[PDB]
Design an enzyme around this catalytic site. Structure first.
Site, PDB file in Angstrom:
ATOM      1  N   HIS A  41       0.810  -1.206   0.000  1.00 27.57           N
ATOM      2  CA  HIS A  41       0.000   0.000   0.000  1.00 27.57           C
ATOM      3  C   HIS A  41       0.850   1.266   0.000  1.00 27.57           C
ATOM      4  CE1 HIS A  41      -4.013   1.675   0.380  1.00 27.57           C
ATOM      5  NE2 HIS A  41      -3.554   2.533   1.275  1.00 27.57           N
ATOM      6  N   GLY A 143      -0.433   5.656  11.281  1.00 28.39           N
ATOM      7  CA  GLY A 143       1.006   5.531  11.187  1.00 28.39           C
ATOM      8  C   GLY A 143       1.568   4.199  11.637  1.00 28.39           C
ATOM      9  N   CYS A 145       0.674   1.386  10.305  1.00 29.19           N
ATOM     10  CA  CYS A 145       0.680   0.505   9.148  1.00 29.19           C
ATOM     11  C   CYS A 145       2.092  -0.001   8.893  1.00 29.19           C
ATOM     12  CB  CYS A 145       0.147   1.266   7.934  1.00 29.19           C
ATOM     13  SG  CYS A 145      -0.163   0.226   6.505  1.00 29.19           S
TER      14      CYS A 145
HETATM   15  C1  LIG Z   1      -6.429   3.722  13.330  1.00 25.53           C
HETATM   16  C2  LIG Z   1      -5.611   2.863  12.365  1.00 25.53           C
HETATM   17  C3  LIG Z   1      -5.142   1.610  12.732  1.00 25.53           C
HETATM   18  N1  LIG Z   1      -4.438   0.871  11.892  1.00 25.53           N
HETATM   19  C4  LIG Z   1      -4.144   1.282  10.677  1.00 25.53           C
HETATM   20  C5  LIG Z   1      -4.573   2.523  10.250  1.00 25.53           C
HETATM   21  N2  LIG Z   1      -4.294   3.025   8.924  1.00 25.53           N
HETATM   22  C6  LIG Z   1      -3.206   3.744   8.715  1.00 25.53           C
HETATM   23  O1  LIG Z   1      -2.323   4.002   9.769  1.00 25.53           O
HETATM   24  N3  LIG Z   1      -2.961   4.213   7.509  1.00 25.53           N
HETATM   25  C7  LIG Z   1      -3.802   3.954   6.522  1.00 25.53           C
HETATM   26  N4  LIG Z   1      -3.509   4.484   5.217  1.00 25.53           N
HETATM   27  C8  LIG Z   1      -2.367   5.356   5.044  1.00 25.53           C
HETATM   28  C9  LIG Z   1      -2.532   6.747   4.978  1.00 25.53           C
HETATM   29  C10 LIG Z   1      -1.401   7.567   4.803  1.00 25.53           C
HETATM   30  C11 LIG Z   1      -1.176   8.991   4.686  1.00 25.53           C
HETATM   31  N5  LIG Z   1       0.117   9.163   4.529  1.00 25.53           N
HETATM   32  C12 LIG Z   1       0.777  10.445   4.381  1.00 25.53           C
HETATM   33  N6  LIG Z   1       0.750   7.995   4.534  1.00 25.53           N
HETATM   34  C13 LIG Z   1      -0.136   6.998   4.699  1.00 25.53           C
HETATM   35  C14 LIG Z   1       0.026   5.599   4.770  1.00 25.53           C
HETATM   36  C15 LIG Z   1      -1.088   4.792   4.943  1.00 25.53           C
HETATM   37 CL1  LIG Z   1      -0.899   3.028   5.043  1.00 25.53          CL
HETATM   38  N7  LIG Z   1      -4.888   3.237   6.723  1.00 25.53           N
HETATM   39  C16 LIG Z   1      -5.828   2.980   5.645  1.00 25.53           C
HETATM   40  C17 LIG Z   1      -5.456   1.812   4.729  1.00 25.53           C
HETATM   41  C18 LIG Z   1      -4.250   1.155   4.875  1.00 25.53           C
HETATM   42  C19 LIG Z   1      -3.934   0.104   4.035  1.00 25.53           C
HETATM   43 CL2  LIG Z   1      -2.395  -0.782   4.186  1.00 25.53          CL
HETATM   44  C20 LIG Z   1      -4.815  -0.272   3.057  1.00 25.53           C
HETATM   45  F1  LIG Z   1      -4.480  -1.298   2.241  1.00 25.53           F
HETATM   46  C21 LIG Z   1      -6.015   0.383   2.899  1.00 25.53           C
HETATM   47  C22 LIG Z   1      -6.348   1.425   3.746  1.00 25.53           C
HETATM   48  O2  LIG Z   1      -7.569   2.079   3.557  1.00 25.53           O
HETATM   49  C23 LIG Z   1      -8.646   1.522   4.272  1.00 25.53           C
HETATM   50  C24 LIG Z   1      -9.678   2.362   4.661  1.00 25.53           C
HETATM   51  C25 LIG Z   1     -10.773   1.857   5.347  1.00 25.53           C
HETATM   52  C26 LIG Z   1     -10.851   0.501   5.631  1.00 25.53           C
HETATM   53  C27 LIG Z   1     -12.064  -0.052   6.383  1.00 25.53           C
HETATM   54  N8  LIG Z   1     -12.972  -0.442   6.944  1.00 25.53           N
HETATM   55  C28 LIG Z   1      -9.833  -0.343   5.227  1.00 25.53           C
HETATM   56  F2  LIG Z   1      -9.926  -1.672   5.514  1.00 25.53           F
HETATM   57  C29 LIG Z   1      -8.735   0.156   4.536  1.00 25.53           C
HETATM   58  C30 LIG Z   1      -5.136   2.769   7.937  1.00 25.53           C
HETATM   59  O3  LIG Z   1      -6.282   2.004   8.197  1.00 25.53           O
HETATM   60  C31 LIG Z   1      -5.323   3.326  11.093  1.00 25.53           C
END
Ligand SMILES: Cc1cncc(-n2c(=O)[nH]/c(=N\c3cc4cn(C)nc4cc3Cl)n(Cc3cc(Cl)c(F)cc3Oc3ccc(C#N)c(F)c3)c2=O)c1
Ligand SMILES: Cc1cncc(-n2c(=O)[nH]/c(=N\c3cc4cn(C)nc4cc3Cl)n(Cc3cc(Cl)c(F)cc3Oc3ccc(C#N)c(F)c3)c2=O)c1
Lengths: 301, 300
Positions: A41, A143, A145
């Site tokens: 991702h 963050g 991830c």
């Molecule tokens: C609270 C928390 C706990 N754990 C992980 C997280 N987290 C994160 O920390 N980042 C995060 N995206 C990012 C934003 C960023 C902004 N910058 C500058 N860099 C970034 C790097 C990343 Cl990765 N995403 C969403 C996410 C991750 C992955 Cl890998 C994916 F493949 C699909 C995603 O989208 C979704 C959206 C909704 C659902 C649903 N239902 C879903 F399943 C997937 C997330 O969920 C948050």
């Protein structure tokens, strides 16, 4: 004596956490020998996250689009490849702190230790169980991830979890280290609901054996029940069915304690039907199902 | 999201655990620079453990009576001294894995991470609170003596607890790193009872703020209470009195949540009077008192 949610020493894994950046997208990566593993991702831009085509996106990138930071040391990417949902970045330096490790997938109900990391810096360590619905009730913020779950056996680290996302209910979804998701989830920024979960019965019974080993005996009774009469009630209370294998793994605790497995089941029938009545077990007012027999045998004597 | 009993990364501490043996007595030690700190009890033979005079026992020992092992590397003792209940063994090799560290004592109600060690090898890490009666409800087995509790602030390890013994109730007692016990206990193989404990109120309130920060609000009410009527109801539930420091420390959480501290107090009073009624908070069916305000802000 005592009984706590104990995690494995996280030092060996701290030695491998790094930061991976592609464009402005940034997350945690795992550095082993000359390879950095991270969720694919990271190659997605804000606009790619909704409906990505990772093969199409990866072809449009080069090795120098990938910034890898280990502390203040910038590692140079010399190769890249995709393995299901995980990205593999070949770098010019082998991690000198690389421990003996294995990539192993875990069964629902197995427990493992999670090292919560942010920007490449570990911030915490805790114990989790793979839920029967293939999610984990973790503790993650934006963050995290790329953080990893793991177990340690005789100096060897078996990494089993790479964190990917948080679902609407607040539980977490992810992959093993080969990029294969746990449960019906995809690395796509779209609403995906967790399935209906169940209670891990063998775990509850192991935790009750730990309670008896540690002085709590108020839940004990003289009653007995058949392995089938208990399964009928467990199903009523959304507990997993209890096999005879689950009984065999509980054998050692039944020996050390001298309480027949079916007797514990009858006490559990008892506990599920009358609640607790303001009482507690090992400091919990609920029946804990996140301790495996292995956990109990290790932390208890 | 989510909320769990999270400990600090234990790597910096795993790098310092060693094994100390004197005679047949063996336990864990903490190796920092060229000093190995361990419970002074290690100088006792089976027959000295009941009623020791550590000064007399220590005078009768020499540096070569202390076998210190770090892996397969035998560290050489070049000096020995007593620091209250802590023994200090000066060795000829300074720990290259020595992190920036400090020796800090903690107040009752504060938390820290415990690295359970046996024969010098760490085996697990978990979160503990110093109980109001100066015990810890830890997880320790025979041979864990010498394990350390600690906190980490920006790469700096504040060592705050050395484990010493287990009491009859299953609680654990120990010292700070200068050898001064927490609570009314001595390093002597005799029956020592834990005092009467009380529930850490400020902590309970912080954990409820964490619940609010994470979406659970069923426990909230519209009632309000004064610090004094609430202290009265608590003292009857064996809760600690809530000081004005404890009120001020919760300020940030009250602000990010918009719930007046006294408003929590009214909700906590209701919870203490009606229980939970088959309900849960952050996955727990009882009121948790081992999360400090700092812990909550760190995880939320
Ligand atoms: C609270 C928390 C706990 N754990 C992980 C997280 N987290 C994160 O920390 N980042 C995060 N995206 C990012 C934003 C960023 C902004 N910058 C500058 N860099 C970034 C790097 C990343 Cl990765 N995403 C969403 C996410 C991750 C992955 Cl890998 C994916 F493949 C699909 C995603 O989208 C979704 C959206 C909704 C659902 C649903 N239902 C879903 F399943 C997937 C997330 O969920 C948050
Ligand atoms: C399960 C568990 C968890 N935590 C720690 C432990 N544990 C241990 O692991 N060792 C342990 N003695 C040892 C036996 C050994 C045998 N060899 C070969 N080497 C040894 C080294 C040690 Cl230290 N002692 C007792 C103990 C420790 C200290 Cl320091 C002390 F100053 C007074 C002690 O005696 C008591 C006894 C009873 C009470 C009471 N009530 C009390 F307050 C103090 C203990 O309690 C055990």
């Amino acid at each position: 004596s005592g009984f706590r949610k104990m995690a494995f020493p996280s030092g060996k894994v701290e030695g491998c956490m790094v930061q991976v950046t592609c464009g402005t997208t940034t997350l945690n990566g795992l550095w082993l020998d000359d390879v950095v593993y991270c969720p694919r991702h990271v190659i997605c831009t804000s606009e790619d996250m909704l409906n990505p085509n990772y093969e199409d996106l990866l072809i449009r990138k080069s090795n120098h689009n990938f910034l890898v930071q280990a502390g203040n040391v910038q590692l140079r990417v010399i190769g890249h490849s995709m393995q299901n949902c995980v990205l593999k970045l070949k770098v010019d330096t082998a991690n000198p702190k690389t421990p003996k490790y294995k990539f192993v997938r875990i069964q629902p109900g197995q427990t493992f230790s999670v090292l919560a990391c942010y920007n490449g810096s570990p911030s915490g360590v805790y114990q989790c169980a793979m839920r029967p619905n293939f999610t984990i009730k973790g503790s993650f913020l934006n963050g995290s991830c790329g953080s990893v779950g793991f177990n340690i056996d005789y100096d060897c680290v078996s990494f089993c979890y790479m964190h990917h996302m948080e679902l609407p209910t607040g539980v977490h979804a992810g992959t093993d280290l080969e990029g294969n998701f746990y449960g019906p989830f995809v690395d796509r920024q779209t609403a995906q609901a967790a399935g209906t979960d169940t209670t891990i019965t063998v775990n509850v019974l192991a935790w009750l054996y730990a309670a008896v080993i540690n002085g709590d005996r108020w839940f004990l009774n003289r009653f007995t029940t058949t392995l089938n009469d208990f399964n009928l009630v467990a199903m009523k209370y959304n507990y997993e069915p209890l096999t005879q294998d689950h009984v065999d793994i509980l054998g050692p605790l039944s020996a050390q304690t001298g309480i027949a497995v079916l007797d514990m089941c009858a006490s559990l029938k008892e506990l599920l039907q009358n609640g607790m009545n303001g009482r507690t077990i090992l400091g919990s007012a609920l029946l804990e199902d996140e301790f495996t027999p292995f956990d109990v045998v290790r932390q208890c004597s």
